[PDB]
Design a protein around this nucleic acid. Structure first.
Lengths: 149, 223, 77, 50
RNA sequence: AGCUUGACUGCGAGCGUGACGGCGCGAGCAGGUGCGAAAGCAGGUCAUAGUGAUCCGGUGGUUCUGAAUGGAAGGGCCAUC
RNA sequence: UUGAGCCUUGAUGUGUAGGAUAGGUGGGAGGCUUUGAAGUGUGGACGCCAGUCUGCAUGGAGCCGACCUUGAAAUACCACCCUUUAAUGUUUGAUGUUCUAACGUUGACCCGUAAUCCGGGUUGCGGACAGUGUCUGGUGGGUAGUUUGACUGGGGCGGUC
RNA sequence: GUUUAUUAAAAACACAGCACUGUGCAAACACGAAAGUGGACGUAUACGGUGUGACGCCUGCCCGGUGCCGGAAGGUUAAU
RNA sequence: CCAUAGGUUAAUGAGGCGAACCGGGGGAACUGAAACAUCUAAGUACCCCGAGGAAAAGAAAUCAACCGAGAUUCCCCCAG
RNA sequence: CGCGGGGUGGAGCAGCCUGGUAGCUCGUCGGGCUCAUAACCCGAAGGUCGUCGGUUCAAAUCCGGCCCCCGCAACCA
């Protein structure tokens, strides 16, 4: 299936580049999410304009939605305790603010029900997927870190 | 493939998938030749009509401007002055009982044998040595007749003989690749209309399943 | 009602016909299955029953255009 | 119809056939039977039943 | 036993019959071929039984028809299954 | 992992007799081999034991028909046609495994609510199996409607239209 | 013991015991525009269902014809 | 948290009785074909539901034929 | 209403692609064997491989038709 890319899917190809993909993988994901378009040069500027009119509902929260990242998004390394030992294993956590804090030595307050764990709960000291919202469908990664014993 | 140098240099002029129009390729047919012997263009037809039943078996011969791609040496078995009439019409050897000893002993210098009905008494004793060569005359296909002068002339004028093979296929040559390609579209119709008049008596509905045309160890052409 | 919840296409009656000629009413029911969506307004995900041509309006206009007009017809999803 | 009827054409092949009660089932014999061709309104030889 | 195909084409006054459908027989005219030296004669078998009305669609010719009309599909006639 | 199918590649032919594994079929005399056979031996392999393929010592353009003989029929040099099957490439299916951006949970916990209904919320487990509907073929009294001629000095065997 | 209201009161029907074919649990089995509920809060020592008929001790032959299970070796062969 | 499930009550609207006609949704069979089965009975009968003085229908992706007619309906014909 | 196969001493079957060429089992008439009878084995006798066409030097055989058999089979008004 010959398509053109509209998203930062750098493992599949470059932005505005024309690539070959499978028709099912396109139909189930890349097409409905607004990430790729069929390679017909006279019909693509319309599909891009159709995504811009849906971007106009959250473009202001891609600009500013975190008081600590007012012009560009930041990557942060965790500073809250990893609650494990030298074996790198733990019972995990149940507290919705007991994890993912990267400014622990400061008077900065952790957000309620804004944490997202894409692969599951941290039950090891291993590196895994962890993010915090800035808006209801817009997330920033944070890097998990071994801290205290 | 794996292909021989003689043909590998001809793929330097021609595409492996395209079958070329016989009205457009008129300078290309002479240009793809490579052999140390004379290359031809031959027609391959699929049947039918029933693939087993011998009542629907097709046989005959058709006259062409170049015949089989050469002239033939014709022999005639005829007694008296009617033999001189065939000698002046297209025969290069006149035959009699003195020649029937040589043919049976093994020696024969002719492509076609014709006979007259009262001379055919002699030739009837050669049916098993002329048989495996397709050289034996037979009244039931017209190669025995009183007008032998016209029958030797029919062979000397250039004709091609055919019959269908197993499961209903038939192959015949329609020219040398060095011969005038402008006439291929004209001579092909003279072959086809004559083969279409040779339909069996108990033939029904259809007759030809597919037509194909190709060069000796070479590319196909389109119609 | 077992419907494609974005178009309101419903079960109905008529005549289906037998394998040969004769009438059969049998009751008609369109094909239907569940699918999950983001709605934005409830800031959460939902499951909704969707089918043929109705799922194709979502293909043509997107989930923000088609799903925003729901929750007005006494809709229990 | 247990009679397997035959139809022949005239010497010239023109117009329609002549349908005949002549049988082919029970005996192999000569099919020429000389009949009327209404394009010439003359009695002529008839040929080929296929 | 010789020659031979009237096991004819297109028309038909009619004659016999059953309630009718329908069944049986047909002078004779016109076309053409066949027998006979010829006058004359041939629409089979010494006669009577040997076979399904129609609706359907197929098959081969025609150019009567054919929804805007020049073609076509489909039908009608002609010739048939 | 393999069923079917299509190209590529390579070889099919010994009724039977001897010099001889005459494929079919139509041509035809100069055509083909220079890691290439000859020919007797220590070897490998298929075998219908004739033949062929490969290796080494070697010798290095032959060889063959026609000649000479065998037979209805030929036997250098060649189109065209056809077998059974694997791998290289590939079209389309099936069984199995695995991942999960589709869908299930007769899993739990939390909130509504110190509610062994249920949704939502958080997290585990299954998974394109299932499930539900749809169309075409097969099957299918489990269910619904319907049919099943007349004469016969009565029925029935026989006779009959 | 049960029984055919008002013409047979039983040799009829029923519990016992035996045999067999299904069914691993969201069982097979069942009613339903389909949830749900009954099987069962049961677990192949349980449950479904059809025979035969408490008890004591037992149960010969035929698989060509009928049905059913696996294959379709060999035939006939749909859809699309 | 943002949000949503959920909880009040202010203002308005609905609700029930209806006489036929009107439109919508469901929907037969006996019967007829002198068999019976596609077809017919018939969108009748009846069940479910809403609204006006009436209701329906409507402003051509109509209908024609090389000429034109120019939204919809009701009656007499076209035509058994 | 169709298709496949078959026609062979007295009964039932061969086959094909060795065309120059009738094979068989079973019975019958007789032996081997045997104390006979059973089990196994092999000599002898008797027929137009139907029938009309066809190719040919030549077909029961192959190629076309027919008929009687042996197994399978379908449709419009």
């Amino acid at each position: 299936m010959q398509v053109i890319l509209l998203d930062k899917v750098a493992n599949l190809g470059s932005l505005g580049d024309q690539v070959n993909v499978k028709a099912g993988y396109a139909r189930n994901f890349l097409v409905p999410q607004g990430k790729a378009v069929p390679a017909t040069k006279k019909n693509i500027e319309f599909f891009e304009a159709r995504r811009a009119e849906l971007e106009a509902k959250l473009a202001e929260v891609l600009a500013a939605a975190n008081a600590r990242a007012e012009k560009i998004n930041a990557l942060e390394t965790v500073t809250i305790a990893s609650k494990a030992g030298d074996e790198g294993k733990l019972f995990g956590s149940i507290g919705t603010r007991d994890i993912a804090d990267a400014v622990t030595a400061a008077g900065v307050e952790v957000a309620k029900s804004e944490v997202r764990l894409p692969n599951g709960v941290l039950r090891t000291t291993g590196e895994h997927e962890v993010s915090f919202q800035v808006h209801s469908e817009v997330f920033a990664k944070v890097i998990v870190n071994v801290v205290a014993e | 493939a794996k292909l021989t140098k003689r043909m590998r240099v001809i793929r330097e002029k021609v595409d492996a998938t395209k079958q070329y129009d016989i009205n457009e390729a008129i300078a290309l047919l002479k240009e793809l030749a490579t052999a140390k012997f004379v290359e031809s263009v031959d027609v391959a037809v699929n049947l039918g009509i029933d693939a087993r039943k011998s009542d629907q078996n097709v046989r005959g011969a058709t006259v062409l401007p170049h015949g089989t791609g050469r002239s033939v040496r014709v022999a005639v078995f005829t007694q008296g002055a009617n033999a001189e009439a065939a000698k002046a019409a297209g025969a290069e050897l006149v035959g009699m009982e003195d020649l029937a000893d040589q043919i049976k002993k093994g020696e024969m210098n002719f492509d076609v044998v014709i006979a007259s009905p009262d001379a055919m008494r002699v030739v009837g004793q050669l049916g098993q040595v002329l048989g495996p060569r397709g050289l034996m005359p037979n009244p039931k296909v017209g190669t025995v007749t009183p007008n032998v002068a016209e029958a030797v002339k029919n062979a000397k004028a250039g004709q091609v003989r055919y019959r269908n093979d197993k499961n209903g296929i038939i192959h015949t040559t329609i020219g040398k690749v060095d011969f005038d390609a402008d006439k291929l579209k004209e001579n092909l119709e003279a072959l086809l209309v004559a083969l279409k008049k040779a339909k069996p008596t108990q033939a029904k509905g259809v007759y030809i399943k597919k037509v194909s045309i190709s060069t000796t160890m070479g590319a196909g052409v389109a119609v | 009602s077992r419907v494609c919840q974005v178009t309101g296409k419903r079960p109905v009656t008529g005549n289906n016909r037998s394998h040969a000629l004769n009438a059969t009413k049998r009751r008609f029911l369109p094909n239907l299955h569940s699918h999950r969506f983001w709605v934005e307004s409830e800031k959460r995900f939902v499951t909704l029953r969707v089918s043929a041509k109705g799922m194709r309006v979502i293909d043509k206009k997107g989930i923000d255009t088609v799903l925003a007009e729901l929750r007005a017809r006494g809709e229990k999803y | 119809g247990i009679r397997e009827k035959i139809k022949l054409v005239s010497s010239a092949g023109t117009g329609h056939f002549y349908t005949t009660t002549k049988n082919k089932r029970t005996k192999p014999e000569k099919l020429e039977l000389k009949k009327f061709d209404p394009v010439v309104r003359q009695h002529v030889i008839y040929k080929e039943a296929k």
